[PDB]
């Protein structure tokens, strides 16, 4: 299936406070009214320039992503996981199952079978959006958690995404996947292009509205 | 250009006297803005006041006369007009005349004209009753005085009802005043938004070329900024000269209209309204002036048949100040702008010649 | 100062813009993150085995206390060039991330490690961008890397050739070790930087401040902005820094612009008197450094305020004029004219019984001087 | 200025709003030329014969 | 090496365009004062007797 | 090396001259309005009664 975003995937281009100021930016955005894939419950996707990624549930079936160029050994990759404990970022050379996942006893993690040469570690319904990008050896992640009053369909509205993480890795990326918690006892993928937007800033400094300046003559 | 930094300020000395010229230009255009207002509004010697008991023959000037319970003692219509329309090295100087002073000037002009006609613009003000002044103005457009005195209440009702519509149409149009405000703000913003361009340098901040850069090389990156900022300031100063030369001509026209439509009755066509000029009233606005033009417009025409002259006793008669007309069977004289027929006599005609050289003579 | 501005010894009555008042800033605080770990360069500048030229290394120095002085003055370096920033000001700046690249080349190939060069090294082994920011350091290492019989372990791409280094090689063929420091500034909140000393913090005084890199001047004041965990400071339309966040206590502070305006001198003319009054334009009259008088146009010093009203003489502004009358100087709200009620009634008329003949003059410029300039000879 | 080339456009982008001002200036002139003609000639209510 | 020359070309070509636009602004204000005189003549010499 | 120093003098003096000529053009247009008004007063005040 395919679906239509309406006004989705707007993130704060950077720090620096700001108030009521229709500020104009050039960056990598998800164009308004786009053609976003639909997935149910998954396969190896491309990256090619950033990614929008939403998801909907009350349980937690979406348990992180895996990135990289080959998703195996012989080249390095990232791995972002969340068991019922908390997030586990990790950067080694792995050996990934071609269909990697984790179970739910509640024993799991048939994800990889190798953790060699680790160069970075870290340990510690609902709509959960994420924007992933990778520039100059930094892997930036923006995110937002809005509550839907549906269960698993893409809604309409405006909600800007706030920066979360910054990782000075150096890693090359060309592909990525997803991770799901099986049954033993809905998600979308947009892509980002270089656009020019007009963001409206509130008096507290939040982005409340935007204009995509390449949609139509009025814009 | 420099923003309080001695490194940039010493390099700037090498450019001579460009920045004394720019200030001279801006001072020369800030003095003429007060000269512009002085010549439109200070067209009186005395400050005239209107009488407490106001009986002007049925005419009602209450929406244009000053109101004490209002802000700055403005008139009711001067309020609708005033309701409709911190940086680096940039300041705004206040005008010499406040808004209170200019509203005082317009109320003195307006009390002079309601009360003395056009006499105060030629000498001492001499009072005259308002309907007799209205009759003089009707004479000035070629209507007789009995036409005013026999239609006084109707003419006064039409005037009151037409002043009542200005108030609606405005309360519910000042684009020429809004545009000069907008242009000046759009230029001042473009001037400040240029303080954040590189013009081909490593940054836009002098504390970033000065911090991360020796004192012998920075001289190449600071000059890049100096040249750009000088260019931008001088462009700002040229476009202000060109915009002030246009505001000056508008104020020169306003000063002529105040003389010729407010302190007089004009005969020039379409200079003080559309119609036949009777009188004009000034009102102050934020950076300008509104004229309310009162004119006479003829209405409800009929056709008759005409002749140039009348033949009688072998002589040709011409009207002294009218036209010969015929209602189908009889011949009268009217005045040319208002139908009021009279019997043709030897008191309203004159004779010259015999009646075989004019073409179109009729017998009567 | 007026006589100097006009270039004359006699000034006529008027009002003249003479300069630009300006408050001075006291003190010069310096906020900086805590002090811990001065960075152990003695691993990249003190390695036992460097890296090839075709696969250089890449160490990402991070949050630390970097002391580029121990580098700059070590006198053991044969080449220390800094490009984005002269060397002595390194221990006074802060960036987001320093990268250090390491490798080994010949002796006369150190001139291709620079922005905008060509040659087998800069073409395809290691290329420096054209707006480089860091510094390049290089020193001879003949005794460590060159071994009798030829050290064939140091290759370069030309597909790969090997320097055969030997201890009896003329200079310019002996191995040099190179380290390229590249300071980058993404868009984070802060990072490593020279460890000055830092100091306390004041509020409500023109001051000269430095907030981990942000250098400026002004009054600092407690804020009430609703900054975000990612929003440290908030600039202003037309792009000027207006707010900062204090690194140590993490509170938002506004940055106002020290009181500054213009200064005008009011003189009756040197042919009348040498007294003078002074207008500080739109400055509150309590922060200027007798007669101090506050106007809608600024603070006036040296004129007394009277209650009379005369015709305007020297225009101050907002309805206020000055004159040399009341012997001294004074201010007042100019008068528009004498008042006059007209004896209006509905059956009264005034008719003149005499007249005067008046003659008045009117002067108009018709022409100006015709001048030409030869553009080439000028 | 540039004219086709692309090395020129990025360099000219460094000068700010110099080109936006010039286009505004020329557009105002062109809008004034129609108002000149409307003010001289369209001085009549009806088209009389 | 080329950016240096292209900046000189840009500077000259931008100066030429500013000269052009400033003179068009000065020349249009002269045409406007003439059309204003024409409007007054059409009002006062064609729509009336002066 | 004479050339690099001569070019800065050429650049500065050209800009000086251009500022002079633009401000003369703006001032001649003000003198022309005055002379047109004086022509109109000569016709309407000396050769007639206004
Ligand atoms: C002149 O006209 C005004 C109307 O603008 C008259 O004043 C108002 O008349 C209405 C009707 O009686 C009252 O409700 C208002 O209170 C009046 N005052 C206002 C609106 O300020 C005024 O009476 C007229 N003058 C004469 C002499 O009739
Ligand atoms: C003056 O008389 C003329 C002559 O009839 C009137 O003009 C004609 O009016 C009729 C009806 O409106 C039209 O059909 C004709 O085309 C008109 N023109 C002619 C006949 O040439 C006119 O209405 C009269 N004017 C007044 C004020 O009564
Ligand atoms: C033209 O006007 C005259 C008015 O003088 C009309 O003639 C008079 O009309 C009244 C009323 O009809 C009569 O009492 C008079 O006897 C008439 N004659 C005179 C000498 O007054 C005449 O009817 C009008 N003609 C038309 C076509 O309207
Ligand atoms: C106007 O009146 C004169 C004099 O009453 C008329 O002149 C006469 O016209 C008749 C007929 O053409 C002649 O027979 C007479 O000899 C004329 N007498 C004189 C003294 O000229 C004249 O015709 C009348 N005009 C009209 C149009 O009827
Ligand atoms: C840097 O040092 C300062 C003190 O010099 C530390 O400030 C302390 O912060 C704790 C909060 O956990 C307070 O309870 C202490 O009272 C503070 N001390 C003083 C003297 O104010 C600061 O925490 C240090 N930096 C870091 C990152 O820990
Ligand atoms: C690498 O380590 C050596 C040894 O610790 C440092 O050499 C010292 O340099 C100083 C200043 O030139 C001398 O006073 C010492 O005598 C040297 N050490 C010894 C053991 O003699 C060297 O400075 C380090 N390199 C860097 C870049 O820090
Ligand atoms: C998205 O693209 C596919 C490509 O074939 C197309 O079939 C589909 O209709 C598109 N969806 C929308 C909403 O345009
Ligand atoms: C969650 O997964 C991480 C991945 O290595 C692991 O380190 C951690 O121990 C797991 N949680 C528990 C409770 O074992
Ligand atoms: C990465 O792992 C492989 C196999 O474990 C090993 O041969 C290689 O040396 C490792 N990389 C580094 C830089 O040591
Ligand atoms: C990423 O892959 C490209 C393949 O074209 C390669 O040239 C590049 O060096 C890789 N990135 C890094 C940091 O090596
Ligand atoms: C945030 O914005 C709202 C509306 O714009 C305002 O009422 C509020 O005071 C602001 N600050 C908060 C909620 O802290
Ligand atoms: C008017 O024209 C008519 C034609 O219908 C003619 O008979 C008559 O003589 C003319 N009269 C005048 C005064 O021109
Ligand atoms: C200027 O000085 C001369 C001689 O000292 C004197 O005649 C003249 O009145 C003075 N002017 C004024 C305005 O005081
Ligand atoms: C100057 O500051 C004082 C102290 O706050 C204040 O009372 C006064 O009103 C200020 N001046 C003006 C013109 O408001
Ligand atoms: C001016 O008059 C006011 C009247 O309110 C009075 O309060 C004030 O003291 C007077 N000023 C002087 C200097 O006498």
mmCIF file of N, CA and C in Angstrom, chain C residues 218-297:
data_model
loop_
_atom_site.group_PDB
_atom_site.id
_atom_site.type_symbol
_atom_site.label_atom_id
_atom_site.label_comp_id
_atom_site.label_asym_id
_atom_site.label_seq_id
_atom_site.Cartn_x
_atom_site.Cartn_y
_atom_site.Cartn_z
ATOM 1 N N UNK C 218 27.831 44.481 26.384
ATOM 2 C CA UNK C 218 26.489 44.916 26.700
ATOM 3 C C UNK C 218 26.139 44.643 28.142
ATOM 4 N N UNK C 219 24.909 44.987 28.466
ATOM 5 C CA UNK C 219 24.286 44.715 29.750
ATOM 6 C C UNK C 219 23.643 43.341 29.690
ATOM 7 N N UNK C 220 23.838 42.561 30.750
ATOM 8 C CA UNK C 220 23.277 41.221 30.884
ATOM 9 C C UNK C 220 22.118 41.291 31.862
ATOM 10 N N UNK C 221 21.025 40.612 31.550
ATOM 11 C CA UNK C 221 19.845 40.674 32.398
ATOM 12 C C UNK C 221 19.165 39.311 32.481
ATOM 13 N N UNK C 222 18.541 39.029 33.622
ATOM 14 C CA UNK C 222 17.801 37.784 33.789
ATOM 15 C C UNK C 222 16.665 37.698 32.786
ATOM 16 N N UNK C 223 16.530 36.541 32.155
ATOM 17 C CA UNK C 223 15.556 36.374 31.095
ATOM 18 C C UNK C 223 14.288 35.708 31.605
ATOM 19 N N UNK C 224 13.319 35.599 30.700
ATOM 20 C CA UNK C 224 12.133 34.795 30.961
ATOM 21 C C UNK C 224 11.710 34.025 29.715
ATOM 22 N N UNK C 225 12.632 33.874 28.769
ATOM 23 C CA UNK C 225 12.368 33.146 27.539
ATOM 24 C C UNK C 225 12.055 31.697 27.875
ATOM 25 N N UNK C 226 11.422 30.999 26.939
ATOM 26 C CA UNK C 226 11.069 29.597 27.131
ATOM 27 C C UNK C 226 11.968 28.710 26.278
ATOM 28 N N UNK C 227 13.274 28.936 26.382
ATOM 29 C CA UNK C 227 14.253 28.168 25.621
ATOM 30 C C UNK C 227 13.978 26.672 25.706
ATOM 31 N N UNK C 228 14.629 25.908 24.836
ATOM 32 C CA UNK C 228 14.457 24.461 24.811
ATOM 33 C C UNK C 228 15.770 23.757 25.134
ATOM 34 N N UNK C 229 15.685 22.510 25.585
ATOM 35 C CA UNK C 229 16.887 21.737 25.915
ATOM 36 C C UNK C 229 17.917 21.779 24.786
ATOM 37 N N UNK C 230 17.470 22.123 23.582
ATOM 38 C CA UNK C 230 18.348 22.202 22.421
ATOM 39 C C UNK C 230 18.538 23.655 22.020
ATOM 40 N N UNK C 231 17.700 24.529 22.567
ATOM 41 C CA UNK C 231 17.774 25.954 22.267
ATOM 42 C C UNK C 231 18.532 26.708 23.355
ATOM 43 N N UNK C 232 19.799 27.005 23.089
ATOM 44 C CA UNK C 232 20.635 27.723 24.044
ATOM 45 C C UNK C 232 20.377 29.225 23.981
ATOM 46 N N UNK C 233 20.684 29.826 22.836
ATOM 47 C CA UNK C 233 20.486 31.257 22.645
ATOM 48 C C UNK C 233 19.483 31.531 21.529
ATOM 49 N N UNK C 234 18.939 32.743 21.514
ATOM 50 C CA UNK C 234 17.969 33.131 20.506
ATOM 51 C C UNK C 234 18.280 34.481 19.892
ATOM 52 N N UNK C 235 18.735 34.467 18.643
ATOM 53 C CA UNK C 235 19.072 35.697 17.936
ATOM 54 C C UNK C 235 17.824 36.522 17.640
ATOM 55 N N UNK C 236 18.001 37.611 16.900
ATOM 56 C CA UNK C 236 16.891 38.486 16.545
ATOM 57 C C UNK C 236 16.865 38.763 15.045
ATOM 58 N N UNK C 237 15.665 38.948 14.503
ATOM 59 C CA UNK C 237 15.502 39.220 13.087
ATOM 60 C C UNK C 237 16.503 40.313 12.764
ATOM 61 N N UNK C 238 17.168 40.188 11.617
ATOM 62 C CA UNK C 238 18.358 40.948 11.238
ATOM 63 C C UNK C 238 19.602 40.364 11.892
ATOM 64 N N UNK C 239 19.446 39.230 12.574
ATOM 65 C CA UNK C 239 20.557 38.366 12.952
ATOM 66 C C UNK C 239 21.577 39.000 13.890
ATOM 67 N N UNK C 240 21.160 39.395 15.088
ATOM 68 C CA UNK C 240 22.091 39.827 16.120
ATOM 69 C C UNK C 240 21.831 39.018 17.380
ATOM 70 N N UNK C 241 22.902 38.581 18.034
ATOM 71 C CA UNK C 241 22.785 37.819 19.272
ATOM 72 C C UNK C 241 22.100 38.653 20.338
ATOM 73 N N UNK C 242 21.007 38.137 20.890
ATOM 74 C CA UNK C 242 20.265 38.869 21.912
ATOM 75 C C UNK C 242 20.158 38.128 23.242
ATOM 76 N N UNK C 243 20.300 36.806 23.210
ATOM 77 C CA UNK C 243 20.202 36.024 24.428
ATOM 78 C C UNK C 243 21.322 35.002 24.436
ATOM 79 N N UNK C 244 21.741 34.588 25.627
ATOM 80 C CA UNK C 244 22.703 33.508 25.785
ATOM 81 C C UNK C 244 22.238 32.611 26.916
ATOM 82 N N UNK C 245 22.895 31.470 27.032
ATOM 83 C CA UNK C 245 22.699 30.550 28.136
ATOM 84 C C UNK C 245 24.030 30.391 28.852
ATOM 85 N N UNK C 246 24.022 30.531 30.168
ATOM 86 C CA UNK C 246 25.267 30.425 30.914
ATOM 87 C C UNK C 246 25.669 28.966 31.006
ATOM 88 N N UNK C 247 26.849 28.590 30.550
ATOM 89 C CA UNK C 247 27.207 27.169 30.514
ATOM 90 C C UNK C 247 27.153 26.488 31.873
ATOM 91 N N UNK C 248 27.594 27.171 32.926
ATOM 92 C CA UNK C 248 27.708 26.515 34.222
ATOM 93 C C UNK C 248 26.353 26.336 34.896
ATOM 94 N N UNK C 249 25.564 27.401 35.000
ATOM 95 C CA UNK C 249 24.284 27.310 35.686
ATOM 96 C C UNK C 249 23.113 27.046 34.746
ATOM 97 N N UNK C 250 23.298 27.230 33.433
ATOM 98 C CA UNK C 250 22.290 26.913 32.406
ATOM 99 C C UNK C 250 21.031 27.765 32.555
ATOM 100 N N UNK C 251 21.214 29.075 32.631
ATOM 101 C CA UNK C 251 20.100 30.008 32.666
ATOM 102 C C UNK C 251 20.229 31.015 31.541
ATOM 103 N N UNK C 252 19.086 31.444 31.031
ATOM 104 C CA UNK C 252 19.028 32.311 29.866
ATOM 105 C C UNK C 252 19.142 33.752 30.332
ATOM 106 N N UNK C 253 19.965 34.528 29.637
ATOM 107 C CA UNK C 253 20.217 35.921 29.963
ATOM 108 C C UNK C 253 20.114 36.750 28.695
ATOM 109 N N UNK C 254 19.360 37.844 28.757
ATOM 110 C CA UNK C 254 19.278 38.754 27.627
ATOM 111 C C UNK C 254 20.471 39.686 27.581
ATOM 112 N N UNK C 255 20.785 40.125 26.369
ATOM 113 C CA UNK C 255 21.931 40.965 26.085
ATOM 114 C C UNK C 255 21.410 42.246 25.467
ATOM 115 N N UNK C 256 21.359 43.311 26.254
ATOM 116 C CA UNK C 256 20.875 44.591 25.761
ATOM 117 C C UNK C 256 22.033 45.397 25.195
ATOM 118 N N UNK C 257 21.730 46.429 24.416
ATOM 119 C CA UNK C 257 22.782 47.270 23.831
ATOM 120 C C UNK C 257 23.087 48.485 24.704
ATOM 121 N N UNK C 258 24.309 48.575 25.225
ATOM 122 C CA UNK C 258 24.683 49.704 26.070
ATOM 123 C C UNK C 258 24.113 51.021 25.562
ATOM 124 N N UNK C 259 23.612 51.836 26.485
ATOM 125 C CA UNK C 259 23.032 53.126 26.137
ATOM 126 C C UNK C 259 23.915 53.868 25.148
ATOM 127 N N UNK C 260 23.340 54.240 24.010
ATOM 128 C CA UNK C 260 24.083 54.959 22.986
ATOM 129 C C UNK C 260 23.149 55.754 22.085
ATOM 130 N N UNK C 261 23.529 56.991 21.799
ATOM 131 C CA UNK C 261 22.736 57.855 20.950
ATOM 132 C C UNK C 261 23.614 58.886 20.278
ATOM 133 N N UNK C 262 23.119 60.112 20.190
ATOM 134 C CA UNK C 262 23.869 61.187 19.576
ATOM 135 C C UNK C 262 23.984 62.348 20.534
ATOM 136 N N UNK C 263 24.853 63.296 20.216
ATOM 137 C CA UNK C 263 25.036 64.461 21.064
ATOM 138 C C UNK C 263 24.982 65.718 20.215
ATOM 139 N N UNK C 264 24.049 66.605 20.535
ATOM 140 C CA UNK C 264 23.909 67.847 19.793
ATOM 141 C C UNK C 264 24.245 69.014 20.700
ATOM 142 N N UNK C 265 24.775 70.072 20.104
ATOM 143 C CA UNK C 265 25.176 71.269 20.827
ATOM 144 C C UNK C 265 24.338 72.440 20.340
ATOM 145 N N UNK C 266 23.702 73.131 21.276
ATOM 146 C CA UNK C 266 22.836 74.271 21.014
ATOM 147 C C UNK C 266 23.598 75.518 21.423
ATOM 148 N N UNK C 267 23.828 76.406 20.473
ATOM 149 C CA UNK C 267 24.576 77.625 20.699
ATOM 150 C C UNK C 267 23.838 78.841 20.157
ATOM 151 N N UNK C 268 23.804 79.944 20.906
ATOM 152 C CA UNK C 268 23.243 81.188 20.360
ATOM 153 C C UNK C 268 24.107 81.854 19.303
ATOM 154 N N UNK C 269 25.287 81.341 19.017
ATOM 155 C CA UNK C 269 26.207 81.933 18.059
ATOM 156 C C UNK C 269 27.346 82.592 18.812
ATOM 157 N N UNK C 270 28.571 82.368 18.337
ATOM 158 C CA UNK C 270 29.756 82.843 19.039
ATOM 159 C C UNK C 270 29.870 84.351 19.034
ATOM 160 N N UNK C 271 29.082 85.016 18.203
ATOM 161 C CA UNK C 271 29.010 86.466 18.109
ATOM 162 C C UNK C 271 27.985 87.031 19.083
ATOM 163 N N UNK C 272 27.478 86.186 19.971
ATOM 164 C CA UNK C 272 26.488 86.599 20.951
ATOM 165 C C UNK C 272 26.945 86.175 22.334
ATOM 166 N N UNK C 273 27.540 84.991 22.410
ATOM 167 C CA UNK C 273 27.903 84.372 23.673
ATOM 168 C C UNK C 273 28.676 83.105 23.362
ATOM 169 N N UNK C 274 29.317 82.564 24.391
ATOM 170 C CA UNK C 274 30.029 81.299 24.279
ATOM 171 C C UNK C 274 29.421 80.233 25.177
ATOM 172 N N UNK C 275 28.275 80.514 25.784
ATOM 173 C CA UNK C 275 27.542 79.491 26.506
ATOM 174 C C UNK C 275 26.938 78.490 25.533
ATOM 175 N N UNK C 276 26.588 77.326 26.058
ATOM 176 C CA UNK C 276 26.204 76.200 25.227
ATOM 177 C C UNK C 276 25.268 75.312 26.031
ATOM 178 N N UNK C 277 24.346 74.652 25.338
ATOM 179 C CA UNK C 277 23.523 73.611 25.928
ATOM 180 C C UNK C 277 23.703 72.332 25.129
ATOM 181 N N UNK C 278 23.400 71.196 25.741
ATOM 182 C CA UNK C 278 23.744 69.904 25.157
ATOM 183 C C UNK C 278 22.539 68.982 25.217
ATOM 184 N N UNK C 279 22.202 68.376 24.086
ATOM 185 C CA UNK C 279 21.109 67.420 23.989
ATOM 186 C C UNK C 279 21.685 66.027 23.788
ATOM 187 N N UNK C 280 21.345 65.112 24.686
ATOM 188 C CA UNK C 280 21.633 63.695 24.528
ATOM 189 C C UNK C 280 20.376 63.057 23.979
ATOM 190 N N UNK C 281 20.427 62.587 22.739
ATOM 191 C CA UNK C 281 19.204 62.269 22.022
ATOM 192 C C UNK C 281 18.664 60.925 22.484
ATOM 193 N N UNK C 282 17.370 60.908 22.781
ATOM 194 C CA UNK C 282 16.593 59.788 23.320
ATOM 195 C C UNK C 282 17.396 58.933 24.300
ATOM 196 N N UNK C 283 18.053 59.618 25.220
ATOM 197 C CA UNK C 283 18.713 58.981 26.346
ATOM 198 C C UNK C 283 18.006 59.421 27.615
ATOM 199 N N UNK C 284 17.758 58.465 28.498
ATOM 200 C CA UNK C 284 17.160 58.814 29.773
ATOM 201 C C UNK C 284 18.153 59.618 30.593
ATOM 202 N N UNK C 285 17.669 60.712 31.163
ATOM 203 C CA UNK C 285 18.570 61.736 31.666
ATOM 204 C C UNK C 285 19.220 61.349 32.986
ATOM 205 N N UNK C 286 19.110 60.090 33.397
ATOM 206 C CA UNK C 286 19.681 59.612 34.656
ATOM 207 C C UNK C 286 20.970 58.829 34.411
ATOM 208 N N UNK C 287 21.276 58.599 33.136
ATOM 209 C CA UNK C 287 22.439 57.800 32.781
ATOM 210 C C UNK C 287 23.351 58.566 31.834
ATOM 211 N N UNK C 288 23.421 59.881 32.010
ATOM 212 C CA UNK C 288 24.188 60.734 31.109
ATOM 213 C C UNK C 288 25.682 60.622 31.390
ATOM 214 N N UNK C 289 26.156 60.807 32.633
ATOM 215 C CA UNK C 289 27.607 60.700 32.777
ATOM 216 C C UNK C 289 28.044 59.321 33.254
ATOM 217 N N UNK C 290 22.619 72.612 38.769
ATOM 218 C CA UNK C 290 22.545 72.797 37.323
ATOM 219 C C UNK C 290 21.157 72.484 36.782
ATOM 220 N N UNK C 291 21.031 72.493 35.460
ATOM 221 C CA UNK C 291 19.750 72.325 34.789
ATOM 222 C C UNK C 291 19.764 71.038 33.985
ATOM 223 N N UNK C 292 19.103 70.011 34.496
ATOM 224 C CA UNK C 292 18.828 68.813 33.725
ATOM 225 C C UNK C 292 17.329 68.753 33.502
ATOM 226 N N UNK C 293 16.938 68.620 32.247
ATOM 227 C CA UNK C 293 15.550 68.716 31.846
ATOM 228 C C UNK C 293 15.283 67.579 30.881
ATOM 229 N N UNK C 294 14.205 66.847 31.112
ATOM 230 C CA UNK C 294 13.879 65.687 30.303
ATOM 231 C C UNK C 294 12.868 66.061 29.234
ATOM 232 N N UNK C 295 13.136 65.636 28.015
ATOM 233 C CA UNK C 295 12.318 65.935 26.863
ATOM 234 C C UNK C 295 11.922 64.622 26.212
ATOM 235 N N UNK C 296 10.855 64.667 25.425
ATOM 236 C CA UNK C 296 10.528 63.561 24.546
ATOM 237 C C UNK C 296 11.607 63.323 23.497
ATOM 238 N N UNK C 297 12.561 64.239 23.353
ATOM 239 C CA UNK C 297 13.627 64.125 22.370
ATOM 240 C C UNK C 297 14.979 63.800 22.996
#
